[PDB]
């Protein structure tokens with residue numbers, strides 16, 4: 001097992017995993033509701049700077065993330081994008097802001113984070129409010145596939161590396177029942193996944209919000225799990 005598993009990462013530690021040239025995932029863990037879960041984000045080299053996708057789920061993990069990036073990569077994180085309003089995506093935004101990172105999210109994500117009492121990224125990403133909308137953000141494309149895991153969920157594509165960061169709209173294969181669906185749109189989630197398939201059919205690596213990467217098979221896997229949950 002080369003990809004770090006929830007079992008191998010102690011409290012408040014962060015692993016990096018090089019997926020491709022100038023693309024890493026970051027992996028952290030927290031206790032939640034009596035179980036330990038892993039959580040993924042992304043790091044994309046942006047010349048001699050780094051673009052961060054998502055916090056490492058809380059302030060302590062996010063401080064450890066910045067220290068791991070300095071140790072293993074040693075280039076400054078200048079911008080971060082949060083892919084939805086939940087604490088595994090925005091928890092630690094204030095740590096990033098204090099370290100001089102420009103934090104970004106859609107106005108949808110910023111609105112929902114403020115309602116929830118979660119940390120609010122400073123900068124707004126325009127042009128992502130309609131299903132199927134894509135915008136460039138330096139070395140990535142940001143895509144709003146429609147409501148799925150959350151109404152605001154974004155996916156991130158790294159064209160140089162054919163890496164699709166699905167975030168929490170995409171489940172790892174080992175997840176065969178629904179995760180947190182309190183904020184989900186079950187009715188639209190499969191339609192939103194099909195938009196991802198149609199936009200990024202060339203993707204070679206697919207990174208879920210939680211757990212092990214795979215290929216585009218994770219999209220069909222997630223549709224299967226969401227449909228089974230719908231039919232509960």
Ligand SMILES: CCc1c(C(=O)O)c(S(N)(=O)=O)c(CC)n1C
Pocket residue numbers: 032037086087088149168178179180181209210
């Ligand atoms: C069950 C895995 C999970 C999810 C999920 O299904 O994505 C989230 S989230 N992004 O807040 O919904 C969390 C954080 C509490 N956890 C532990």
Ligand SMILES: [Zn+2]
Pocket residue numbers: 084086149150168180
């Ligand atoms: Zn979430």
Ligand SMILES: [Zn+2]
Pocket residue numbers: 102103122123
């Ligand atoms: Zn700024």
Ligand SMILES: [Zn+2]
Pocket residue numbers: 086088168209210
């Ligand atoms: Zn999540």
